[PDB]
Swiss-Prot record:
Other comment: Lysozyme C is capable of both hydrolysis and transglycosylation; it also shows a slight esterase activity. It acts rapidly on both peptide-substituted and unsubstituted peptidoglycan, and slowly on chitin oligosaccharides.
Protein location: Secreted
InterPro entries tied to this protein: Glyco_hydro_22, Glyco_hydro_22_CS, Glyco_hydro_22_lys, Lysozyme-like_dom_sf
Matching SMART domains: LYZ1
Name the record gives this protein: Lysozyme C
Enzyme class, first EC level, given as a word: hydrolase
Catalytic residue positions: E35, D52
GO biological process: cell wall macromolecule catabolic process; defense response to bacterium; defense response to Gram-negative bacterium; defense response to Gram-positive bacterium; killing of cells of another organism
Enzyme Commission number(s): 3.2.1.17
Annotated substrate binding sites: D101
Gene name of the encoded protein: LYZ
Length: 129
């Protein structure tokens, strides 16, 4: 599925991301925009043997299990396939875990390199929430 910004914002808010651990909702929408262009099936296969999965491009070394990644920790306790669902449950819960494990949103390269410091609230402007 390819979300719209406002549709994604609303779903992320239903899943408890707005201001979660100090990250206003637009941060999460911005991260998704630049990680995956809002595509729930986005998949980036890296040369280290890990892969980034789903709308938030969560990586298979620390976070999800794909059985092909060296050093796997599966800290989200999910198959990476769950991160490719059209519903965002697993991706949001795993995103929450990433931050609960002490990583900021700096964990998402696209957030760091594109969203941080900007007017991220623009991503939710005009949306019904």
């Amino acid at each position: 599925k390819v979300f719209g910004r406002c549709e994604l914002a609303a779903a992320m808010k239903r899943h408890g991301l707005d201001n979660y651990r100090g990250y206003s909702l637009g941060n999460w929408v911005c991260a998704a925009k630049f990680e995956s262009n809002f595509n729930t099936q986005a998949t980036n296969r890296n040369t280290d043997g890990s892969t980034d999965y789903g709308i938030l491009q969560i990586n298979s070394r620390w976070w999800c299990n794909d059985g092909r990644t060296p050093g796997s920790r599966n800290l989200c306790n999910i198959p990476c396939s769950a991160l490719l669902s059209s519903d965002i449950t697993a991706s949001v819960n795993c995103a929450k875990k990433i931050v609960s494990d002490g990583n900021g949103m700096n964990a998402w390269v696209a957030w760091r390199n594109r969203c941080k410091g900007t007017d991220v609230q623009a991503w939710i402007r005009g949306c019904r929430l």
